[PDB]
């Protein structure tokens, strides 16, 4: 009998406790040892209907991964002073020498571990005086922590089983006659990014575009690639030399002093590489909308930076890379693209519940490598004279990251 389930999740991994990375310990300590040597039993003449858009597994995973943040904002990560008015100066100083209005070196009186002993020190704003806090500003990065998506395996509930559709082209919302029972999931990483899908799954056949209602322009357009595109993100400069904690509730997080070749950060990815994939996408789209309709892509028309540009986590530090150039083109039915990005630490997590703030990056520079495995777009629409259809970068609901994986998974109850 094929019922449910609905709902629960049981995470797991083979990562050892020797690693202290935040996502590793969320899978090593907050979850249980996994089971290597995966195995599937294909069902014989059985058709299972999936529903990714009302899938409780996605809801659970979305809640859980967000809830995992509670694990950090409790022990060591805090919401405390200081928010003393920081007074900002010009670019500092000798080695840079750069046209960057984003790195704001601002000074303030920092109270030490001593009751009433202040000290003039420097910090960094990004984007006068102030321009900080005024909200649930959750500070402190603590030692170790470190954020990077780690493969987490989810195994069937006690008494229940996980069904997995093996359909190379599955809308995630229909019947699948090709379905197998599997002990646990392949291992789903807590991908933290907007607009772009980093290190997700790939379609077996062609680029799979999915959306509850593709005609409904409030719905996000999930575009699962059949090929990876390597994004190599690198910090051109260096600074914030490690962390210097001051007192029980005091810390010199940020600045450093060593500075370097300060300049706008960015990621390297051959522009032709994902230009290929955009070719694939517009071919899929035009076949969905008119069978011969011109497909135009455009950048964000506004909104919070987090969803306006490509926000993603690299090593705990959040980068906001403007990828307008990756959209600004039209497809009618050695050079690489270089995207301008910005590092923050202030991030809006949950539903405006608070703003997590980490730092310092520690050490210097940084390198993160992740392969794009799909996009999230949103269609404009128009009248009968719309002709060419316009897609702009979407995002805003990280749950989509889980949808792109769980569309083929479904826990089931048997009698």
């Amino acid at each position: 009998v094929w019922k449910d389930a609905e709902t629960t999740l049981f995470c797991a991994s083979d990562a050892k406790a020797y690693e202290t990375e935040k996502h590793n310990v969320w899978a090593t300590h907050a979850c249980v040892p996994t089971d290597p040597n995966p195995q599937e039993i294909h069902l014989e003449n059985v058709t299972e209907e999936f529903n990714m858009w009302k899938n409780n597994m996605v809801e659970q995973m979305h809640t859980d991964i967000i809830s995992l943040w509670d694990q950090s904002l409790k022990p060591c990560v805090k919401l405390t002073p200081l928010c003393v008015t920081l007074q900002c100066t010009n670019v500092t100083n000798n080695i840079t020498d750069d046209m960057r209005g984003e790195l704001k070196n601002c000074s303030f009186n920092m109270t030490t571990e001593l009751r009433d002993k202040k000290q003039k020190v420097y910090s960094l704003f990004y984007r006068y005086r102030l321009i900080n806090c005024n909200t649930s500003a959750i500070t402190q990065a603590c030692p170790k922590v470190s954020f990077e998506p780690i493969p987490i395996h989810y195994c069937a509930p006690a008494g229940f089983a996980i069904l997995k559709c093996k359909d190379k082209k599955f809308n995630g919302t229909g019947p699948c006659p090709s379905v197998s029972t599997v002990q646990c999931t392949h291992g789903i990483k807590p991908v933290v990014s907007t607009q772009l899908l980093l290190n997700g799954s790939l379609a077996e056949e062609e680029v799979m575009i999915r959306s509850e209602n593709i005609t409904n322009n409030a719905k996000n357009i999930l575009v699962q690639f059949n090929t990876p595109v390597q994004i190599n993100c690198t910090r051109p400069n260096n600074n914030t030399r490690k962390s210097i904690r001051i007192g029980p509730g005091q810390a010199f997080y940020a600045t450093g002093d060593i500075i370097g070749d300060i300049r706008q950060a960015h990621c390297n990815v051959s522009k032709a590489t994902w230009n290929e994939t955009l070719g694939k996408v517009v071919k899929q789209l035009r076949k969905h909308f008119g069978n011969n309709t011109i497909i135009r892509f455009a950048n964000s028309s506004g909104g919070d930076l987090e969803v306006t540009t490509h926000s993603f986590n690299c090593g705990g530090e959040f980068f906001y890379c403007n990828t307008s150039g990756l959209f600004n083109s039209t497809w009618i039915s050695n050079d690489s693209i270089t995207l301008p990005c910005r590092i923050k630490q202030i991030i809006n997590m949950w539903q405006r519940i608070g703003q997590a703030m980490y730092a310092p990056p520690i050490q210097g520079v940084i390198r993160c490598v992740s392969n794009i495995t799909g996009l999230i777009l949103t269609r404009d629409g128009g009248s009968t004279n719309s002709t060419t259809e316009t897609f702009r970068p979407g995002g805003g609901d990280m749950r989509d990251n889980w949808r792109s994986e769980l569309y083929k998974y479904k826990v089931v109850k048997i009698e």
Partner: antibody
Amino acid sequence: QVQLVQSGSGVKKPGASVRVSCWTSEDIFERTELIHWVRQAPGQGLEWIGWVKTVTGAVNFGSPDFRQRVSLTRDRDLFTAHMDIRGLTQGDTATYFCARQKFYTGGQGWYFDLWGRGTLIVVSS
Amino acid sequence: EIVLTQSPGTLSLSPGETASLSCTAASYGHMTWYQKKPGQPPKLLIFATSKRASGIPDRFSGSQFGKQYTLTITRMEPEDFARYYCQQLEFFGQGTRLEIRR
């Protein structure tokens, strides 16, 4: 369906700009995902403008014309929505409403929980 | 095809009669339908095609035949006469004026 508290009716000139405000109680603001906007010409039907997300502030419109002409901003802390229109033209003379679309509308189409009071914007020198 | 063709543009029927409005969709999907009185904001009467909103009289029913969105208003009262509009996603219909037949 308690009306969403909009700004008073206003008169601007061609080439001018205006921020038409619309705000309501916390509950409704938290119930609604996007804030949409729609205008009607005098003696005409409904002409849909665009929407702005209450979670992210992301925007999208029925036309690039609205993308440039109309800037939709929002503030959760103030539970208020702003509509800024620049390069006001004669054809922008119309009555404007905001409308709230709750979460979990599924595939039921665009239905709205609350509607705005209504703001008449006139563009004339 | 134009997204919506709401008709007729004007419908005059006497009190106690049943109004039958047709909004022809260019596509498939669930429909919504609003009342709008003179000087008053639009007001959701029917959503999801055939699911009336809370606080809406049962005499307001809805359906669809293929793409022909159907709207039924039985036993119309004198206070049930106004402007009405269909909507499919971000698009509105042509608009209808419901009037009293004399």
